[PDB]
Motif scaffolding. Structure first.
Motif, PDB file in Angstrom:
ATOM      1  N   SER A 114      16.191  16.131  39.315  1.00 25.85           N
ATOM      2  CA  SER A 114      17.192  15.859  38.292  1.00 25.85           C
ATOM      3  C   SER A 114      17.132  14.404  37.853  1.00 25.85           C
ATOM      4  N   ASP A 115      17.100  14.200  36.542  1.00 26.45           N
ATOM      5  CA  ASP A 115      17.422  12.913  35.954  1.00 26.45           C
ATOM      6  C   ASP A 115      18.940  12.766  35.938  1.00 26.45           C
ATOM      7  N   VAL A 116      19.418  11.526  35.951  1.00 25.48           N
ATOM      8  CA  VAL A 116      20.855  11.254  35.954  1.00 25.48           C
ATOM      9  C   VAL A 116      21.361  10.863  34.570  1.00 25.48           C
ATOM     10  N   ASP A 117      20.688   9.923  33.910  1.00 23.04           N
ATOM     11  CA  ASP A 117      21.168   9.384  32.641  1.00 23.04           C
ATOM     12  C   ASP A 117      20.779  10.334  31.512  1.00 23.04           C
ATOM     13  N   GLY A 118      21.778  10.998  30.929  1.00 20.14           N
ATOM     14  CA  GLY A 118      21.577  11.978  29.886  1.00 20.14           C
ATOM     15  C   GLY A 118      21.513  13.408  30.381  1.00 20.14           C
ATOM     16  N   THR A 119      21.262  13.604  31.672  1.00 21.80           N
ATOM     17  CA  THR A 119      21.118  14.922  32.278  1.00 21.80           C
ATOM     18  C   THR A 119      22.305  15.294  33.149  1.00 21.80           C
ATOM     19  N   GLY A 223      16.047  17.414  33.059  1.00 25.73           N
ATOM     20  CA  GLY A 223      15.864  16.162  32.346  1.00 25.73           C
ATOM     21  C   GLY A 223      16.567  16.190  31.006  1.00 25.73           C
ATOM     22  N   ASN A 224      16.386  15.104  30.239  1.00 24.56           N
ATOM     23  CA  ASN A 224      17.019  15.016  28.930  1.00 24.56           C
ATOM     24  C   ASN A 224      16.149  14.384  27.849  1.00 24.56           C
ATOM     25  N   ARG A 225      14.890  14.051  28.129  1.00 23.32           N
ATOM     26  CA  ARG A 225      13.991  13.489  27.124  1.00 23.32           C
ATOM     27  C   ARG A 225      12.607  14.096  27.319  1.00 23.32           C
TER      28      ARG A 225
HETATM   29 MG   LIG Z   1      17.472  10.471  31.104  1.00 28.35          MG
END
Ligand SMILES: [Mg+2]
Length: 277
Positions: A114-119, A223-225
């Motif tokens: 897991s990503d944290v920033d945005g996710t 993720g988010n990107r």
């Molecule tokens: Mg991110």
């Protein structure tokens, strides 16, 4: 920064131990560090300090972020979370002590990223994530969080994760990783660069390479990107098991080319994340 970036150790099939780089920081040949693992002092093992605070195991001399199997076996680690403490000892400064987490996984263990920033945080927490990760971890997987935030905020992000509460479902506990551009000392400075700008992938392939390559540890990633998707492909994750969340909060199941949500994914939890043996 004064702390320990979470340490991951994997027991190989022949009962040897391999590990990711140790990232210990205090913030100089006089000072020598000692290690306490689960409230027990580890005999005959010490680390040394460089001028910039970077610490290493001096190995006969090579300065090593990754200790050998012989060092790690003395730790007497147990599977799962282990508490490890680093005590800086100096004539001028007595004892300065820091605390951290060290994780022992088996070689057949399966990891979810897991990503944290945005996710985990809206571009402020996404509404169903804690139930999803709780159900994933319940099936026998292990959650491994990933961060590209600066080193200064390392303790805040980890503390932020524990305080997260959503309808009584809390995030399952797992180590938090950092892209190596955030963790830069002269010991590791030259290698972080052969890895160009693909830091997230380099860290995941590095984490994958701690396991035997006869097995695939990294099951899936969140993720988010585009970088989050690129990294998981490179690290041995199939496009089917890759989910990136947009700003409008739709989880895009990349391989299946359909938009979904954490609550929807949690509904079909077993088919997407089958219970391990
Ligand atoms: Mg991110």
């Amino acid at each position: 920064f004064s702390g320990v970036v979470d340490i991951i150790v994997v027991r190989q099939p022949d009962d040897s131990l391999k590990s990711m780089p140790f990232h210990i920081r205090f913030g100089n040949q006089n000072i020598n560090i000692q290690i306490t693992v689960n409230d027990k002092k580890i005999e005959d093992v010490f680390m040394l300090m460089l001028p910039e605070g970077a610490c290493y195991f001096p190995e006969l001399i090579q300065k090593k972020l990754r200790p050998s199997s012989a060092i790690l076996k003395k730790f007497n680690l147990k599977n799962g979370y282990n508490k490890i403490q680093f005590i800086a000892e100096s004539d001028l400064q007595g004892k300065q002590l820091i605390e951290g987490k060290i994780y022992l996984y088996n070689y057949d263990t399966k990891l979810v990223i897991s990503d944290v920033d945005g996710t985990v945080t809206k571009s402020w927490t996404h509404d169903d994530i804690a139930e999803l990760y709780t159900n994933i971890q319940k099936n026998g997987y292990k959650m491994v969080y990933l961060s590209s935030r600066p080193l200064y905020f390392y303790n805040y992000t980890q503390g932020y994760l524990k305080g997260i509460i959503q309808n009584g479902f809390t995030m399952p506990d797992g180590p938090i990783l950092l892209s190596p551009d955030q963790i830069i000392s002269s010991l590791n400075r030259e290698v972080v660069y052969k890895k160009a700008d693909e830091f997230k992938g380099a860290l995941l392939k590095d984490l994958r390479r701690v396991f035997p390559e006869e097995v695939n540890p990294i099951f899936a990633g969140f993720g988010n990107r585009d970088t989050d998707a690129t990294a998981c492909l490179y690290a041995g994750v199939i496009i089917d098991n890759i989910f990136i969340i947009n700003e409008q909060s739709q989880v895009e199941i990349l391989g299946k080319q359909e938009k979904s949500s954490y609550k929807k994914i949690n509904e079909k939890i077993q088919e997407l994340f089958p219970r391990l043996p």
